[PDB]
Design an enzyme around this catalytic site. Structure first.
Site, PDB file in Angstrom:
ATOM      1  CB  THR A  73      11.419   4.362  -1.573  1.00  0.00           C
ATOM      2  OG1 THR A  73      12.307   4.729  -0.512  1.00  0.00           O
ATOM      3  CG2 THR A  73      10.449   5.497  -1.840  1.00  0.00           C
ATOM      4  CB  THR A  74       9.214   2.257   3.095  1.00  0.00           C
ATOM      5  OG1 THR A  74       8.535   1.488   2.097  1.00  0.00           O
ATOM      6  CG2 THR A  74       8.243   2.563   4.222  1.00  0.00           C
ATOM      7  N   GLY A 100       5.966   2.714  -0.242  1.00  0.00           N
ATOM      8  CA  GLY A 100       5.752   1.487   0.489  1.00  0.00           C
ATOM      9  C   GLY A 100       5.234   1.652   1.895  1.00  0.00           C
ATOM     10  CB  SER A 121       8.057   1.286  -5.536  1.00  0.00           C
ATOM     11  OG  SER A 121       7.551   1.663  -4.267  1.00  0.00           O
ATOM     12  CB  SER A 122      10.114  -0.675  -0.974  1.00  0.00           C
ATOM     13  OG  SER A 122       9.105   0.314  -1.064  1.00  0.00           O
TER      14      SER A 122
END
Lengths: 64, 226, 220, 203, 238, 248, 204, 237
Positions: free
Chosen positions: D1-2, D131, D169-170
């Site tokens: 995630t970001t 991210g 992870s994004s």
């Protein structure tokens, strides 16, 4: 199950509207098992209403 | 001091004053019929400004336990909130007993935080409780200091004396079907000053199927043909 | 343990397996993993069964009390908030993973609750050990605004996939369908696994099992 | 995630990914990481999802109550102070990176960062999440001063897109939120609308 | 009263709190004060009775600084007044620590007023015997000035006075035309008004404690430079 | 000035509050316990017998408090309920701790200690309730105890605690015979004294509630005599009365 | 491991209008038997029994505490315990010690006081109820009881054959496990009688 | 004695402390009216401002408890502010504990419970301020309630509180008995003419402060000088 007593009320209303006496007397003499199957107060008030409607119009003073 | 207090030589003067206040004026009759229990009460609002669907006198504390009360409605709320929490705690601990009538006696007993711990000022409300989760109905009364009375029919209003006299004279009886609510409305009629109507009169019924506060439609239906 | 839920057109459909196992041995074959909360909301459990049951019973009791005090129907958002507060207070010591579903006055809602307190509102949710298979089934065969029978079939397919592709889940399929006016529990909705009949009368008659001593205490 | 925030003249623009990872499995591919703390104040969450949600909800409690008791919209600085206090007092238990932004008439578009630890800092732009560490050079090189609303929107969308495509992870979709005196406008970029820098490495 | 005026928890038969009705009397008896919202700030002022020349330069000053930009001019029972000023300082510090920046004056007055009301609600504790103005200025919110009575609530005041002679002060305050007059001429006029109010007609000599807040001080509520406001006191004397 | 309760002495040195409460215990309620070999029984007077009750609690005065004992209050019902709950809690706590039924004397001493504390310290009202206990233990067999609100219990074998307790105890002293006393003659004595202390002759079985504790084969059975058995006892007593009166 | 510290093996099965609960009667530390008459089946009522398996000390403590709570509840209400209610009470008592749990796995076997409906349930250490209608067990060799029961059980079984089946299952399981055995006690609960039997078991 | 000095039941069977506390509301010299309508709920109280040194900007007696609930206080201002703060705390805490906003009836119930606790016990005393809070509730229309120093929370359609509350209630009873629904104009005009007939000063559009909650427009609009002036011009026409 109470729709039968609604139908009895409806039939009594039409009998009162038309002015029938013998048919209303027969219905009152017939509905007794349904009277002794429901709330005492409701059955009693139905009986009172039917009797008053019968005694209203047709003046059979020897039968009322 | 900070409990149910003020008991002189052979008296409970504060409790007696509390009962004088619970004399109240809301008749709130209750009848234990064979099929179930009826708790009927009078909602005579001052003027037409107030509302009747806004506040209620009959409260379902749980699935088949219904509750009606007497004077001091502000105290009665708090009391019914406590009662709901108590019945819920009991149901949570003894999980899933569908506890209403094997719980009606128990909640009446746990109505000791009701009064045995008064709270400096004792509660000023006497409340009737109805339950039918035992195959048999139960009508109990808890008063601002006493305990479960286990009535069959009573009233807690301004004219509760002649109301109870009317109940016994009209023979609360034992064979009465569930529709002794007619007799309950009659008993109210006695302690009522006005053409009672659906919003004017609030009644709850607790039969073996459960508890239910009768809506104005059914209340007006019953009031018709009286 | 595999539980799942979907938001169909008129409400929510929840499904669950009924295999409660102790370690690697099946203990319960009809463990009810779908728990009533309010007559409009149910919730499917996973993880530590006892923690899940206690938490869901506490939430159901508190929400029943709340609904009684308000006089209105409860709300799935309120149930979520209560669950999230309770779980995050314990920081995941409550090993309970939940799939809340319900119908509110604002529309059907479906949420996932994680043991550490995480929540999110999703059109479809899966949880449990065999959650991955059911999630894959939803991803493959999920269509928004899909009717009642089709949604029930989709949940049944996902639960069956979880059952037949995870050993620690199964035996039965429990379903619940909820809408604005309908609450229908189904219990064993489909039994894809039947025990074979025992060949031969593998029973012991009386006379065997020699007893050292016997005591009889009759009652009323 | 970001998660990312940019401050422009008269407002801010926030961009967040929709992915929340658990190990190597995608728990929620459509996560809504732009939590409205108030009407004109938004929060971007990163890290422990449960902890972020709890902190954001508690701060929304306190901030809404505070705004009601003042009869005035709260300051973005006040919100960031609430987040920094909440994160700092419980940093040993709560591990979450939070990006706060919004608009208030007192100062205008404001952006603050409260990473794990409980520190508050005011920045022209803010960047965080798993991210984030992959687009630092891009966001620093391709950021101008006095960028307008559309410039900031496109630039943040690009930065989120590259962070998504690079970090494992994004992924999923992108959520943008433009906050200004007129209000907040939230939009979602999905599928083909995602700004893509294709990498066609020659055979 | 007689029977009902013993504890604040006992309502009057007509429905009044005679404990607070009597706590207001201490404020009515103690020496007066005044505060005027100038155009770009707030100027305080309070005569202090030097009960004996044994005392040093003006001490137990009716002015206090509750926060960087906020000032409190108090009258009534001075000890409880000081304790309440400490409560206000603690409240401002707590707000600055929690929400950052500076505490808005309306909220500070509201919180201290709710705290005061907490002390009149109960029975074991007694109402505070003091009334005070809280004055503050900032660029964003202009200048605000709220008066708290011993039991009542904050009220926005263009100009207010409290103490021994409230009406006598308020007449000339309302005569004065605020909202367009700078804090300098206001600092002159508040001294003028205090000196118009009786100082030695039945009492001793009085000291003129004057306070400032405004853009001329960029906030930062501070006591006016007394050396340079001695001429303002002179102009008041004339 | 604030109100302070009265847990104090007298210029003479009496605790007149406690004495007034103890005397008020005589007012309202009527219970009596008679101890006999192979069975000890309690009789209680049903004060309010309004026809609108249902009698679903199954017991108002007599309370089962433990497997091996049962008590009967004669005080304010508000205090009586909490006192019975505390008594059961004490007995069951002893059962948990020692894995053995609690001896009756120890139980009564615990209860009277709690009442003594209630009259001793703090601004708390004395527990205006006096109660009997009948029990069986391993050490002393059938035992009967009477506790007053003063907390000064006493080990009795034939006593009454109600309104006309003086008349009842005088009747018990006149027609009580130890040793020869058995369960059935104990019942006859109990119904006779109840008929004496209740002015209306031919007491209905509804107005009298009686419970007998008996020792079956290694097990204590506490049976509350139901309506039919009670009125059969009444009929036997009536036969005895008629015979004795007519034979003169 | 810890649950196997003192051994133990408790079975419960359902017949036609009758129930059966059995347990090994061995008490000992890891390897040795200390006594052969330890009590793991406790009567909560005329027609309701509880079986406990785990540490012997936790067995005794749970039995004692449960008896205390049950006696209080019975005194409060005046009506006999329903077995479902007692199972719920046991679950609550176990969960009250969630983080210090009594390492026991209780089972409930009984009949309704009025409807005489057989009821058998099991709980884990935390207190999760597993109510079924065929059989439950607990202890170190729960897998052995499962393996035996899944073939030896028949629905709607007369009390005699129910006793035969439960006896066979318990005997074979305590023969095939290493920590429990040296005597099996079995209680058959009918609508009017209790049959308590001590089986002839391998005392080794 | 002390029957009339502390919160204890009277020998006659009454509670005199709360009976006194109700008269505290009449004390303070103010009145307030609230009218529920076909779709909106409008309330209005007079703004008694002695001398202009005060700030008419902040002398108000109506407040926003939450984004959709607006309250009007009547009685001692210190207790009024305390109860407003308590109501705001309850609204925020409810929104935190349960996701959906707090229904006005539930909020009034919680405030009434707090007041009932106050009239219980003897250490504290009841707060002499009666609160009329209104708000739009879905599936309910506009909703108006009144919590009182006792704990009795009710009140509907047309309810008033203050010194001359009885006359206002009588007039509003006449108006409601006149069977015709009030639109978002008739409701406001009815409230205005009610309060004006109670205190005939013709109500220069500066001495009352009216709050409005419609259904299509939620939120507690504290109507400005221009809006109240427009309503006054339209009414006196």
């Amino acid at each position: 199950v109470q729709v039968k007593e609604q139908s009895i009320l409806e039939l009594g209303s039409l009998l009162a509207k038309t002015g029938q006496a013998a048919e209303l007397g027969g219905l009152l003499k017939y509905v007794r098992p349904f009277l002794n199957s429901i709330s005492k107060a409701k059955a009693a008030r139905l009986v009172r209403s039917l009797l008053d409607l019968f005694l209203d119009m047709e003046a059979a003073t020897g039968q009322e | 001091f900070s409990l149910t207090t003020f008991s002189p030589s052979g008296k409970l003067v504060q409790i007696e004053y509390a009962l004088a206040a619970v004399a109240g004026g809301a008749p709130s009759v209750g009848i234990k019929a064979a099929n179930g229990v009826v708790l009927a009460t009078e909602k005579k609002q001052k003027s037409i400004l107030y509302d009747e669907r806004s506040v209620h006198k009959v409260e379902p504390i749980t699935k088949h336990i219904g509750l009606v009360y007497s004077g001091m409605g502000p105290d009665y709320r708090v009391l019914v909130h406590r009662a709901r929490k108590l019945a819920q705690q009991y149901y949570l601990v003894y999980q899933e007993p569908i506890p209403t009538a094997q719980l009606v006696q128990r909640v009446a007993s746990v109505m000791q935080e009701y009064t045995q711990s008064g709270g400096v000022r004792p509660f000023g409300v006497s409340l009737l409780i109805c339950g039918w989760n035992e195959g048999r109905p139960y009508l109990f009364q808890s008063d601002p200091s006493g305990a479960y009375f286990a009535w069959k029919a009573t009233a807690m209003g301004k004219n509760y004396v002649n109301g109870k006299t009317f109940l016994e004279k009209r023979y609360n009886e034992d064979l009465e079907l569930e529709d002794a609510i007619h007799t309950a409305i009659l008993t109210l009629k006695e302690s009522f000053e006005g053409q009672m109507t659906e919003d004017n009169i609030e009644v709850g019924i607790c039969n073996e199927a459960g508890f239910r506060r009768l809506t104005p439609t059914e209340v007006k239906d019953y009031l018709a043909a009286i | 343990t595999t539980i799942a839920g979907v938001v169909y057109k008129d409400g929510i459909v929840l499904g669950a397996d009924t295999r409660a196992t102790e370690g690697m041995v099946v203990a319960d074959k009809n463990c009810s993993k779908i728990h009533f909360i309010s007559p409009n909301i149910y919730c499917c459990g996973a993880g530590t069964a006892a923690d899940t049951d206690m938490t869901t019973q506490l939430i159901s009791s508190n929400l029943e009390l709340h609904s009684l005090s308000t006089g209105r129907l409860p709300r799935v958002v309120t149930a979520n908030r209560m669950l999230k507060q309770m779980l995050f207070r314990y920081q995941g010591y409550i090993g309970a993973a939940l799939v809340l579903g319900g119908v509110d006055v604002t529309g059907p809602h479906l949420y996932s609750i994680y043991p550490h307190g995480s929540t999110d509102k999703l059109p479809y949710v899966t949880m449990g050990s065999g959650s991955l298979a059911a999630m894959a089934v939803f991803e493959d065969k999920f269509r928004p605004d899909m009717e009642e029978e089709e949604a029930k079939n989709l949940v049944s397919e996902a639960i069956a996939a979880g059952i037949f592709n995870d050993l620690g889940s199964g035996s039965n399929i429990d379903l619940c369908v909820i809408s604005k006016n309908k609450l229908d529990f189904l219990r064993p909705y489909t039994v894809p696994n039947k025990k074979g009949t025992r060949l031969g009368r593998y029973r012991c008659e009386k006379g065997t099992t020699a007893v050292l001593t016997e005591k009889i205490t009759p009652l009323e | 995630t970001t998660i990312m925030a940019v401050q422009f003249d008269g407002g801010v623009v926030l961009g967040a990914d929709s992915r929340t990872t658990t190990g190597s499995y995608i728990a929620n591919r459509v996560t809504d990481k732009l939590t409205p703390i108030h009407d004109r104040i938004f929060c971007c969450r990163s890290g422990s999802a449960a902890d972020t949600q709890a902190v954001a909800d508690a701060v929304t409690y306190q901030l809404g109550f505070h705004s009601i008791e003042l009869n005035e919209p709260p300051l973005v600085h006040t919100a960031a102070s609430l987040f920094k206090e909440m994160c700092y007092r419980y940093r040993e238990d709560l591990m979450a990176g939070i990006i706060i932004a919004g608009w208030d008439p007192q100062e205008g578009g404001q952006v603050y960062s409260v990473p794990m630890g409980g520190m508050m800092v005011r920045q022209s732009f803010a960047i965080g999440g798993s991210g984030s560490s992959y687009i630092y050079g891009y966001v620093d090189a391709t950021y101008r001063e006095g960028m307008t609303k559309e410039e900031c929107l496109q630039f943040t969308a690009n930065a989120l897109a590259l962070a998504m495509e690079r970090d494992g992870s994004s992924g999923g979709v992108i959520r943008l939120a433009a906050i200004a005196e007129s209000g907040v406008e939230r939009q979602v970029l999905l599928g083909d609308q995602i700004p893509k820098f294709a990498v066609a490495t020659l055979p | 009263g007689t029977g009902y005026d013993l504890s604040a928890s006992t309502f009057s038969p007509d429905g009044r709190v005679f404990q607070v009705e009597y706590a207001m009397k201490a404020v009515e008896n103690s020496s007066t004060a005044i505060g005027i919202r100038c155009k770009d700030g707030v100027v305080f002022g309070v005569e202090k009775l030097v009960l004996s020349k044994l005392y040093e330069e003006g001490s137990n000053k009716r002015l206090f600084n509750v926060d960087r930009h906020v000032g409190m001019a108090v009258a009534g029972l001075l000890a409880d007044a000081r304790s309440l000023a400490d409560i206000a300082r603690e409240e401002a510090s707590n707000f600055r620590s929690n929400f950052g920046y500076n505490i808005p004056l309306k909220h500070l007055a509201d919180r201290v007023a709710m705290y005061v009301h907490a002390y009149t609600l109960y029975s074991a504790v007694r109402p505070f015997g003091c009334s005070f103005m809280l004055g503050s200025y900032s660029v964003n919110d202009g200048a605000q000035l709220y008066m708290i009575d011993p039991s009542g609530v904050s009220y926005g005041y263009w100009g207010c006075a409290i103490g021994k002679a409230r009406q006598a002060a308020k007449t000339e305050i309302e005569k004065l035309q605020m909202k367009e007059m700078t804090c300098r001429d206001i600092v002159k006029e508040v001294a003028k008004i205090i000196y118009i109010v009786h100082d030695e007609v039945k009492d001793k000599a009085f000291e003129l404690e004057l306070s400032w807040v405004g853009e001329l001080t960029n906030g930062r509520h501070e006591i006016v430079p007394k050396d340079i406001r001695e001429e303002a006191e002179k102009y008041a004397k004339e | 000035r604030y109100d302070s309760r009265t847990t104090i002495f007298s210029p003479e040195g009496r605790l007149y509050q406690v004495e007034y409460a103890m005397e008020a215990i005589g007012h309202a309620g009527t219970c009596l316990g008679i101890l006999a070999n192979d069975g000890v029984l309690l009789a209680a007077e049903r004060r309010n017998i309004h026809k609108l009750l249902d009698e679903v609690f199954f017991s108002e005065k007599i309370y089962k408090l433990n497997e091996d004992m049962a008590c009967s209050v004669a005080g304010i019902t508000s205090d009586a309920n909490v006192l019975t709950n505390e008594l059961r809690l004490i007995a069951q706590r002893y059962l948990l701790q020692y894995q053995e039924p609690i001896p009756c004397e120890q139980l009564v001493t615990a209860l009277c200690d709690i009442k003594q504390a209630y009259t001793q310290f703090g601004g708390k009202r004395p527990f205006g309730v006096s109660l009997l206990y009948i029990g069986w233990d391993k050490h002393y067999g059938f035992q009967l105890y009477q506790s007053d609100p003063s907390g000064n219990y006493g080990g009795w074998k034939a006593t009454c605690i109600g309104n006309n307790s003086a008349a009842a105890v005088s009747m018990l002293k006149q027609d009580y015979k130890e040793g020869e006393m058995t369960l059935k003659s104990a019942l006859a004595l109990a119904i006779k004294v109840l008929n004496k202390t209740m002015d209306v002759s031919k007491l209905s079985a509804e107005k009298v509630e009686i419970a007998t504790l008996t020792r079956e084969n290694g097990k204590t059975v506490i049976r509350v005599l139901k309506q039919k058995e009670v009125e059969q006892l009444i009929k036997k007593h009536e036969e005895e009365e008629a015979k004795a009166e007519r034979e003169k | 491991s810890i649950m196997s510290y003192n051994g133990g093996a408790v079975m419960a099965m359902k017949g036609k209008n009758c129930v059966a609960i059995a347990a090994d009667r061995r008490f000992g530390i890891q390897a040795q038997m200390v006594t052969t008459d330890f009590q793991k089946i406790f009567p909560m009522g005329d027609r309701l029994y509880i079986g406990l398996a785990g540490l012997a000390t936790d067995v005794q403590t749970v039995a004692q505490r449960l008896k205390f709570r049950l006696n209080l509840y019975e005194l409060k209400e005046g009506r006999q315990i329903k077995p479902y209610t007692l199972m719920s009470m046991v679950a609550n008592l176990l969960y009250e010690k969630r983080f210090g749990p009594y390492y026991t796995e209780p089972v409930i076997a009984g009949l309704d006081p009025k409807t005489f409906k057989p009821f058998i349930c099991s709980l884990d250490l935390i207190g999760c109820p597993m109510v079924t209608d065929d059989f439950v067990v607990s202890g170190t060799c729960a897998e052995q009881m499962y393996g035996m029961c899944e073939s030896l059980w028949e629905p709607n079984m007369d009390p005699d054959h129910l006793f035969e089946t439960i006896s066979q299952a318990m005997l074979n399981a305590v023969d095939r496990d290493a920590v429990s055995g040296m005597g099996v006690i079995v209680h058959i609960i009918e609508k009017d009688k209790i049959t308590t039997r001590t089986l002839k078991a391998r005392m080794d | 004695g002390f029957d009339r000095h502390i919160t204890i039941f009277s020998p006659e069977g009454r509670l005199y402390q709360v009976e006194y506390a109700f008269k505290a509301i009449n004390q303070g010299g103010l009145t307030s009216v609230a009218v529920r309508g076909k779709d909106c709920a409008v309330i209005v109280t007079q703004k008694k401002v002695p001398d202009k040194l005060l700030d008419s900007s902040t002398v108000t007696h109506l407040f926003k408890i939450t984004e959709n609930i607006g309250c009007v206080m009547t009685g001692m201002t210190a207790d009024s502010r305390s109860q407003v703060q308590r109501a705001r705390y309850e609204a925020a805490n409810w929104k935190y504990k349960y996701g959906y906003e707090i229904p006005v009836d539930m909020l009034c119930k919680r405030i009434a419970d707090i007041s009932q606790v106050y009239t219980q016990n003897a250490e504290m005393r009841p707060l002499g301020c009666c609160m009329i809070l209104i708000g739009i509730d879905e599936e309910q229309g506009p909703q108006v309630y009144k919590c009182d120093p006792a704990g009795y929370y009710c009140g509907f359609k047309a309810t008033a509180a203050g010194v001359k509350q009885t006359e206002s209630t009588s007039f509003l009873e006449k108006k409601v008995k006149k069977k015709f629904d009030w639109t978002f104009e008739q409701t406001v005009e009815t409230a205005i003419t009610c309060l004006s007939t109670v205190l005939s000063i013709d109500f220069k559009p500066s001495e009352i402060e009216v709050g409005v909650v419609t259904v299509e427009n939620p939120k507690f609009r504290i109507l400005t000088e221009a809006e109240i002036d427009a309503h006054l011009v339209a009414l006196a026409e």
